[PDB]
Every structure is written in structure tokens, then in C-alpha cells.
């Protein structure tokens, strides 16, 4: 597995998961990239993403994380992780 | 019906159809952007 980076400051989305679909040579045609969404078992529905206007050009990731690794003990390293854990997840989880 | 210029020097796709999600206040929810893609009729084959 790999891991995307954002403490460098985003171009935009990253290309292997906003790349529309891809094209494989095993039949030598086109399919739908899976990384866009995927169908939530026995539900009805998708799953679909939304950017927000603020997560490029920014380096408020950058010093949040600088400030939140300065520290020295555990739980209070604990809590300043969760926070910016579930930043990102909220900036890119939109109004869906 | 609108009309797309593409005599533009142009930078990416118009956003009225390459973004496949929309948020619309009618029912203060998401739906998929139609423009993304339609299937073909009965053939279980979808465009790109």
C-alpha cells in the first residue's frame, strides 16, 4: 500500500485517483478507474467525493502538524493527531 | 441549449461536465453529474 502526502502543498487531487478511467493492455481497452467510487454493498447508493475550495495553496496542514509534533509526552500528542486526522477528512468530505 | 467554445485556448475541461457530483439546495443533497457519462440503452455499456 502507499501513502499520499499533503504536507507539501497539493497541485491539485492526485493524478492515480482523479484520473477519469484507465486503459489496460491485457484487453486493450478502457474501464472505469474503481478509485472515483464504488458501490456501498446492499444499499441503493454510491459513494461520491467533493472537493472543497481551500485545500490547495495552504500551509496550514504544514505547521498544524509541525505544532502538533513539537510536543514531548504521548497523550497530548494523542489528541492534536485525532485533530488533524479528521481535518482533511471533513475538507474533503463535503456537503455529501 | 448552451454552446461550449473550444476555439478558446483552453486550460482544462468546462466544470459543467467534467466534475461527475453536485450539491443541489432543491432537496439539500448530492447527485451525480449527468454530463459525466450515460449508458447506452439496454446494452449494459456506459460511455467515457
Redesign the interface.
Known amino acids: 500500500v502507499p501513502y499520499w502526502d499533503w504536507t507539501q502543498p497539493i497541485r491539485q487531487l492526485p493524478a492515480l485517483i482523479n484520473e477519469?478511467?484507465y486503459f489496460d493492455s491485457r484487453s486493450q481497452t478502457?474501464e472505469?478507474n474503481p478509485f472515483?467510487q464504488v458501490k456501498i454493498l446492499d444499499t441503493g447508493k454510491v459513494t461520491?467525493?467533493?472537493p472543497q475550495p481551500e485545500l490547495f495553496n495552504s500551509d496550514y496542514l504544514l505547521n498544524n502538524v509541525l505544532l502538533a509534533l513539537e510536543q514531548t509526552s504521548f497523550c497530548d500528542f494523542e489528541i492534536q493527531f485525532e485533530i488533524v486526522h479528521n481535518a482533511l477528512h471533513s475538507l474533503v468530505g463535503?456537503?455529501?
Do not use: H, N, Q, V
Request: glycine fraction near 18%; avoid cysteine.
Open positions: 477519469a478511467s478502457e472505469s472515483f461520491t467525493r467533493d463535503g456537503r455529501g
